[PDB]
Design a binder for this molecule. Structure first.
Ligand SMILES: [Zn+2]
Ligand SMILES: [Zn+2]
Lengths: 15, 56
């Protein structure tokens, strides 16, 4: 089960 | 060769958010919470490719 976690409410944009 | 970027969840909500798994057949992404996935599953399949009890 390839798990791609893309939470993008407040913390979804690194650097 | 490998990408697909298809958000096909029981939600009916096209949104890549939270933890999402790839349906082995149709190569979509779906939120673990709605489908009741374990993330550590051998091979996950959406309710279209492999009907599973969905109580949401
Ligand atoms: Zn969902
Ligand atoms: Zn599927």
């Amino acid at each position: 089960a390839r798990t791609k976690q893309t939470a993008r409410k407040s913390t979804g944009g690194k650097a | 060769s490998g990408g697909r970027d298809v958000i096909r969840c029981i939600c009916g909500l096209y949104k890549d958010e939270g933890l999402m798994i790839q349906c082995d057949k149709c190569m979509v992404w779906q939120h673990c919470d709605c489908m009741g996935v374990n993330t550590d599953v051998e091979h996950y399949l959406c309710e279209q490719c492999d009907p599973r009890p969905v109580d949401r």
